Amino acid sequence: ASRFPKFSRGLSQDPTTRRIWFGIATAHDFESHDDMTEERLYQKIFASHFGQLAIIFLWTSGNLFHVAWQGNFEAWGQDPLHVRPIAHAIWDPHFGQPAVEAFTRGGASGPVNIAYSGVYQWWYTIGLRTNQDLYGGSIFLLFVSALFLIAGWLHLQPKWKPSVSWFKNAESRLNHHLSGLFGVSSLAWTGHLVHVAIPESRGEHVRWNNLLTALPHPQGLGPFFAGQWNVYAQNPDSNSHLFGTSEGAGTAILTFLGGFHPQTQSLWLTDMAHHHLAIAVIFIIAGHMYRTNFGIGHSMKEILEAHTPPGGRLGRGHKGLYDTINNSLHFQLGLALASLGVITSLVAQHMYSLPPYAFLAQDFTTQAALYTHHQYIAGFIMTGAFAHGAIFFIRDYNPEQNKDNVLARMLEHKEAIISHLSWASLFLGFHTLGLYVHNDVMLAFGTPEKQILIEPVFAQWIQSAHGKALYGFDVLLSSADSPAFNAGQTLWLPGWLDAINNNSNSLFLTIGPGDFLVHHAIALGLHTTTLILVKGALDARGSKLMPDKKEFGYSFPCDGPGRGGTCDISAWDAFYLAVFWMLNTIGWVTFYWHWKHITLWQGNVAQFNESSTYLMGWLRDYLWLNSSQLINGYNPFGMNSLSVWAWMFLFGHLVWATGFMFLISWRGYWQELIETLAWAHERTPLANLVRWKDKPVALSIVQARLVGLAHFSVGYIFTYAAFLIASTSGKFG
Amino acid sequence: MTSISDSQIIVALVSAFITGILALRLGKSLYQ
Amino acid sequence: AHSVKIYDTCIGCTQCVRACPTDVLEMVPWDGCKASQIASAPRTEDCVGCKRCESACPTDFLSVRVYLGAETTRSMGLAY
Amino acid sequence: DVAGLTPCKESKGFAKREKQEIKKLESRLKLYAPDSAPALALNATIEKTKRRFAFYGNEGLLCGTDGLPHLIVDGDQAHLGEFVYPGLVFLYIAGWIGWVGRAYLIDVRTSKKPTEKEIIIDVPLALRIMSKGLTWPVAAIGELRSGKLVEKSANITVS
Amino acid sequence: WDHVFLGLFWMYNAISVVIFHFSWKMQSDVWGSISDQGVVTHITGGNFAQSSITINGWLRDFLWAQASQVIQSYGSSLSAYG
Amino acid sequence: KYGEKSVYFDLGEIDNTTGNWDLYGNDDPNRYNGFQNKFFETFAGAFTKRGLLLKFLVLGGATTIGYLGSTSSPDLLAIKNGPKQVPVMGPRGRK
Amino acid sequence: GARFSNYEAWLSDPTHIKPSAQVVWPIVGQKILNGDVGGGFQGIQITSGFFQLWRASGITSELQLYTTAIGGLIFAALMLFA
Amino acid sequence: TPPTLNADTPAPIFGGSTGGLLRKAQVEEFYVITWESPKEQIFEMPTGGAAIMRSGPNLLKLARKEQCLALGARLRTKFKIQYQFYRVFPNGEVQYLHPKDGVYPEKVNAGRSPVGVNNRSIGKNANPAELKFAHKQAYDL
Ligand code: CLA
Ligand code: CLA
Ligand code: CLA
Ligand SMILES: CC1=C(/C=C/C(C)=C/C=C/C(C)=C/C=C/C=C(C)/C=C/C=C(C)/C=C/C2=C(C)CCCC2(C)C)C(C)(C)CCC1
Ligand SMILES: CC1=C(/C=C/C(C)=C/C=C/C(C)=C/C=C/C=C(C)/C=C/C=C(C)/C=C/C2=C(C)CCCC2(C)C)C(C)(C)CCC1
Ligand SMILES: CC1=C(C/C=C(\C)CCC[C@H](C)CCC[C@H](C)CCCC(C)C)C(=O)c2ccccc2C1=O
């Protein structure tokens, strides 16, 4: 309390440098602070969430301002396919003149950075056209962040502090959040689309000054209240429409065309409008479900209690889970993180194949960057979901209240779960690695016709069920006699079939034996990471080796060398181990995506179709082949604009290597070395005049694991980001 | 065709300073 | 400032006391075992956390347990 | 045919690959004496390549665009030899080895010192158990139905 | 024992650097083919003096350049090396 | 360290016992000249106070760095000199 | 080296015949490892430098190498007995 | 028992080392171990090196309690020598520590009271969720 860790006495009284490290590392864990009550915990969390919102909005405002100030948004808008967007300017005093010449891209007057976030396409699609629009948005977002800061400060005041019962009103919070935050927000977005952005793509200009007089439709709101909702879809945009101009432009606002806009190769705007309108209606209806102050609606506890199978196969069913979830913040955090990870993976998978932004899918580097970014985010989020679930088992789980319900019966057959997961992982690993090595041996001996190439007929059958007429399966949407084809042949199927039978886009790419092998390696990675995380979560409360782990908390180094040795015994260590597998799996996924799309964009898909069936093919035709321009960023003959990416590549290799030092070498060596260093310092003339305040010590065991994992992950991310950006920007194809 | 005026930059900087003061107040409230 | 607890499954073999490198443990007269003695931990302020006592305890599960806690210049084993 | 795959005999690219391999082997052969051992070895390799290509073409394998055989494992009656038959043979062999190992473990469990027989194998008993593994599926189903295959009172940790 | 365990890693590091230095310097400045009139052409053309002063130089002109043989050895008598 | 015999522990002399000595400390008061001291105490004595020293250091460093950065001539800094060559086109004709 | 090598052909032409003393059996496509080292011989090229050592020792026939091999086996038996 | 005092007894014959006392002894506690020897013998210093112990009383300054206890354990198990050690503070306070009541800790002695003894098995401890928002640790109960 006296010293820096004001929230911890044990850390405050520590005389070593461990105090600073652990005060930093445990600052944002409010349940562990001294004299912490539930009410203070909830209010502090609520204010911190306000602060996070303010930070997010300031980040967006900064992007907008820097693009409006130093970017060529208007020049890019004039010629989207021939101008490189500008992220921010460069002012580095350490440059030399050749670098200043090399980084002057775009139409800029000085060195700049080319943007790969895709915000140009997103802002252009939603109606923003000039720099004044971006400036207005930046100022507005500054105001919004200020509003959230004021809100946090106010709702922390004694008069305005909410009570603990307010934070536990699940039905009312879910009712408002589901109705407003989802349905009304999507309804407002549909309003923006219809009222502003659709006219922009047809050569109109609608702003705040003429919003009240510019009709979205020639006969506005007449048919809507007359029941003639089909009037708004009469005249869609033509296939010869030019985005941003009135050439071949329709007047419909809610079409249901399906497919892609031919000029921009993205989804129609009116499709997106009807989509967000339907989503808004569904969410607003779904909000009016749970009971509140008006005496109608369902009650979530009664729903959980009623659902319980007779015959006792599930035990007591979902009984008692309401209080377990309401009183545990870690259970809620785990559920939210799992859902968010699934949703992020969905975003990544569904954005590369159905691009929503005009001019995207022609900026190859942006597409690759977006995919990799959100996929790595999803992986980290999933690992966090499992970690905070393990924290729930250790901290908030009460065995007596969850007597014989589903939650306890999960702990009941945990050995069966872990055993069958181990079997699945072993099976996938053995037979997949065996097939890869067998193919390697076959091609090494000069006989590539002896390799085991298995056709992925299930995924091909699914593709044919979608209407792809390449594999000759002739089922469902591929069959003209099917009821589904006849039912959909007028609403959405023309455009959808035209898009899915095109072999130039990324909508249901053609697949072969290599794709089969890679999806199987991905399945191996998923089941193995799940094995590690589930083993950590279920064995968190105790095992045969240490039956009282729940008394030692979530994170602790070990239990000593007794009983054979107990290194890496806590559930935190299972998190630590599973992070490596998560990184490896996401690496496999991104490697596969990037190589397939490189071959697609160069037009040479045969190289992937032939070289992906063996591992030497990967190592030779992906990495070594595509690292040429990257490693030639700077050489004894000068430097290119890829110099920064080459430097980042080497930087990532170096940081990743440095992480190994913390990962492999442990503490006692370093502690003794520091002891010798302290002796040396105390005995040196002109240096004894200076004394340390904190006694130097080596890092803790858990701290060493964390620092090694951090250096490792940073090196991983920076290396792959540099390689991806350079290998896709050197060619742009 | 627009290029952002200098007075616009002045306004943005002043607004950012005010937002920073508000953030300082919120952080002080959280710490105490 | 580690905490050392003794549980009533102790048999009084005195191995933990002999194994302690900082003289934290000692034997105390008791009733409840054939040896009629039990271990005690009065000098827990001098415990370093080596867990030799736990390694020396013969029992299905340990009768002596060490719970690591706040670190001090004595717990850290610093000679400087 | 299936997934737009052509038969190997009908396909072009299979024959192109055969021609390329034979041409490479003959180019290597051009350096040696006609009656020397390297010439005989290279000729043997050439004949083996010809026989392999003929067998693959005549066995009824589908061929991809790149000219290499592909496998079908969805259960098709025309391609059972690709997956289903070797799978059944492997299942028989693996069940045999696993079943005889389990039987030997069970028989050794009731001994004066099971660990000694665990490291030093009782060869006569092992041979008897190994020979009795021909009809392992029948014995396995027998013990599954008789209730002598699974256990109910096993050691577990604190739930 | 653990000190020997770490010394093994550092010995590996040292010897790897030593053998890389030997290989590059020999290929770049000693080994080569000589023709009539006594003109010497080296395997890597004397690039050690300029390209070995940078880590990027090593990565590009030694590991990337000289590994082309091992990764292209499939289908030949050198396939076992790959 | 009493020092009479092989005794090195003595509660009376605890600084000797703990080895708290001054190895090279010299306490001769006469080092410099009187007028040197007059001049240096007159001029260098202003910066004795430490809070004022912190404020002066921070303000002076900020002012110096800003003035040098914003008024440096192009012939010294390449970043202020700016590009002097025609820009290079991108791969697919993208500028 | 006495039975599975091209040491005599190498002796005739040291600068063109690649040394080779290991020959692989034809079983699963291993044939490709038997390279064309020269001297009407197919086998794995060796880098142990035994051909140079034998030439410096004055060995010019396989009979001498076979005699040395027999002597080595006798010495191995003697060491075992000792 | 009446705890003993300290006096001016000779130190062992040692030639010096770099493993001796540091500034911690100056600004914090340091430890002194005393024993009596029947003859001069060579023993290994806990700080590294070999020393000769005098005939009669001996006194040795050490930086940690573990060093004193390791040296005393070696003396007892190898030379059959009884020993004592104390704790010394910078102001001059002396604290007698190892044979607290004159009997070594591995021998049961009357007058000792249990400390930290829990009257249950280790498996009967409570759950961390039961003691939520409370300062107990489930092993202090
Ligand atoms: C209608 C009223 C209403 C509204 C609008 C909100 C809104 C909010 N409440 Mg809330 N609340 C309400 C009533 C309401 N509440 C009531 C009645 C109670 C008491 C019973 C509470 C109690 C409460 C608590 C206790 C907390 C909140 C919090 C929050 C915020 C959540 C963080 C956030 O912004 O998520 C934004 C989420 C979305 C916009 C949903 C988007 C859907 C998915 C995720 C993405 C889909 C969009 C699309 C695909 C992507 C497009 C993006 C673009 C780049 C293309 C949010 C602003 C939390 C907070 O942060 O505090 C400040 C918090 O801790 N509320
Ligand atoms: C390849 C990655 C890598 C790197 C860089 C290091 C680095 C180091 N290890 Mg090490 N180590 C590693 C992997 C690595 N380790 C692995 C994998 C293991 C397991 C076997 C070990 C095991 C190990 C042991 C067992 C020991 C070391 C030691 C050392 C140190 C060597 C002496 C020294 O100070 O070097 C000086 C040189 C450097 C630190 C690198 C150059 C400096 C760079 C260029 C940056 C400097 C300027 C920088 C920009 C400052 C500005 C910062 C500012 C911008 C914030 C050094 C900190 C030894 C030690 O403690 O040293 C006495 C030692 O005993 N390591
Ligand atoms: C008697 C032999 C035998 C039998 C019947 C089983 C049976 C089983 N094992 Mg097991 N296992 C064995 C030996 C055996 N194991 C040995 C020796 C090892 C050490 C390598 C393992 C390691 C092991 C792991 C790591 C896992 C299993 C799993 C399993 C289950 C699923 C099958 C599987 O994954 O096989 C896998 C089989 C192997 C990895 C090795 C097979 C070794 C063969 C059988 C030879 C060894 C036996 C012996 C030398 C034969 C000679 C006997 C002779 C004297 C008559 C199943 C209950 C999995 C599970 O729990 O799923 C529920 C699982 O994850 N086992
Ligand atoms: C440990 C723990 C935890 C955690 C957990 C987790 C983390 C989990 C996860 C999980 C997950 C992560 C899951 C996922 C899932 C998913 C799913 C299950 C899906 C499904 C889908 C479907 C079914 C679909 C269908 C379809 C199709 C196919 C097509 C179209 C149509 C439709 C839609 C119908 C918690 C916190 C709880 C707490 C306690 C402990
Ligand atoms: C001067 C003089 C002298 C001296 C002498 C001498 C000193 C001598 C010596 C001698 C000698 C000292 C001899 C020797 C010999 C040896 C030998 C002869 C050897 C051989 C060997 C071999 C042949 C081997 C082989 C092999 C190999 C190579 C490999 C492995 C196997 C084997 C082992 C088989 C005298 C005294 C007389 C006196 C007078 C003067
Ligand atoms: C090298 C190493 C050390 C020694 C390293 C130490 C003491 C770290 C010293 C780091 C100095 C202080 C510089 C840190 C610079 C960083 C770039 C920034 C630190 C974080 C900021 C937020 C301050 C250990 O203590 C250790 C302990 C247990 C297992 C492995 C290891 C281990 O590998």
Curated annotation (Swiss-Prot), chain A:
<feature type="transmembrane region" description="Helical; Name=XI">
    <location>
        <begin position="706"/>
        <end position="726"/>
    </location>
</feature>
<keyword id="KW-0460">Magnesium</keyword>
<dbReference type="GO" id="GO:0015979">
    <property type="term" value="P:photosynthesis"/>
</dbReference>
<comment type="subunit">
    <text>The PsaA/B heterodimer binds the P700 chlorophyll special pair and subsequent electron acceptors. PSI consists of a core antenna complex that captures photons, and an electron transfer chain that converts photonic excitation into a charge separation. The eukaryotic PSI reaction center is composed of at least 11 subunits.</text>
</comment>
<keyword id="KW-0004">4Fe-4S</keyword>
<feature type="binding site">
    <location>
        <position position="670"/>
    </location>
    <ligand>
        <name>phylloquinone</name>
    </ligand>
</feature>
<dbReference type="GO" id="GO:0000287">
    <property type="term" value="F:magnesium ion binding"/>
</dbReference>
<dbReference type="InterPro" id="IPR001280">
    <property type="entry name" value="PSI_PsaA/B"/>
</dbReference>
<keyword id="KW-0603">Photosystem I</keyword>
<feature type="transmembrane region" description="Helical; Name=V">
    <location>
        <begin position="329"/>
        <end position="352"/>
    </location>
</feature>
<feature type="binding site" description="axial binding residue">
    <location>
        <position position="661"/>
    </location>
    <ligand>
        <name>chlorophyll a B3</name>
    </ligand>
</feature>
<feature type="transmembrane region" description="Helical; Name=II">
    <location>
        <begin position="134"/>
        <end position="157"/>
    </location>
</feature>
UniProtKB/Swiss-Prot annotation, chain C:
<feature type="binding site">
    <location>
        <position position="57"/>
    </location>
    <ligand>
        <name>[4Fe-4S] cluster 1</name>
    </ligand>
</feature>
<feature type="binding site">
    <location>
        <position position="10"/>
    </location>
    <ligand>
        <name>[4Fe-4S] cluster 1</name>
    </ligand>
</feature>
<feature type="binding site">
    <location>
        <position position="20"/>
    </location>
    <ligand>
        <name>[4Fe-4S] cluster 2</name>
    </ligand>
</feature>
<dbReference type="InterPro" id="IPR017896">
    <property type="entry name" value="4Fe4S_Fe-S-bd"/>
</dbReference>
<keyword id="KW-0479">Metal-binding</keyword>
<dbReference type="GO" id="GO:0009055">
    <property type="term" value="F:electron transfer activity"/>
</dbReference>
<keyword id="KW-0677">Repeat</keyword>
<dbReference type="InterPro" id="IPR017491">
    <property type="entry name" value="PSI_PsaC"/>
</dbReference>
<keyword id="KW-0408">Iron</keyword>
<keyword id="KW-0934">Plastid</keyword>
<dbReference type="GO" id="GO:0009773">
    <property type="term" value="P:photosynthetic electron transport in photosystem I"/>
</dbReference>
<dbReference type="GO" id="GO:0046872">
    <property type="term" value="F:metal ion binding"/>
</dbReference>
Curated annotation (Swiss-Prot), chain E:
<comment type="subunit">
    <text>The PsaA/B heterodimer binds the P700 chlorophyll special pair and subsequent electron acceptors. PSI consists of a core antenna complex that captures photons, and an electron transfer chain that converts photonic excitation into a charge separation. The eukaryotic PSI reaction center is composed of at least 11 subunits.</text>
</comment>
<comment type="function">
    <text>PsaA and PsaB bind P700, the primary electron donor of photosystem I (PSI), as well as the electron acceptors A0, A1 and FX. PSI is a plastocyanin-ferredoxin oxidoreductase, converting photonic excitation into a charge separation, which transfers an electron from the donor P700 chlorophyll pair to the spectroscopically characterized acceptors A0, A1, FX, FA and FB in turn. Oxidized P700 is reduced on the lumenal side of the thylakoid membrane by plastocyanin.</text>
</comment>
<comment type="similarity">
    <text>Belongs to the PsaA/PsaB family.</text>
</comment>
<protein>
    <recommendedName>
        <fullName>Photosystem I P700 chlorophyll a apoprotein A1</fullName>
    </recommendedName>
</protein>
<feature type="transmembrane region" description="Helical; Name=IX">
    <location>
        <begin position="3"/>
        <end position="24"/>
    </location>
</feature>
From Swiss-Prot, chain G:
<comment type="similarity">
    <text>Belongs to the PsaA/PsaB family.</text>
</comment>
<comment type="subunit">
    <text>The PsaA/B heterodimer binds the P700 chlorophyll special pair and subsequent electron acceptors. PSI consists of a core antenna complex that captures photons, and an electron transfer chain that converts photonic excitation into a charge separation. The eukaryotic PSI reaction center is composed of at least 11 subunits.</text>
</comment>
<feature type="transmembrane region" description="Helical; Name=II">
    <location>
        <begin position="65"/>
        <end position="82"/>
    </location>
</feature>
<comment type="function">
    <text>PsaA and PsaB bind P700, the primary electron donor of photosystem I (PSI), as well as the electron acceptors A0, A1 and FX. PSI is a plastocyanin-ferredoxin oxidoreductase, converting photonic excitation into a charge separation, which transfers an electron from the donor P700 chlorophyll pair to the spectroscopically characterized acceptors A0, A1, FX, FA and FB in turn. Oxidized P700 is reduced on the lumenal side of the thylakoid membrane by plastocyanin.</text>
</comment>
<protein>
    <recommendedName>
        <fullName>Photosystem I P700 chlorophyll a apoprotein A1</fullName>
    </recommendedName>
</protein>
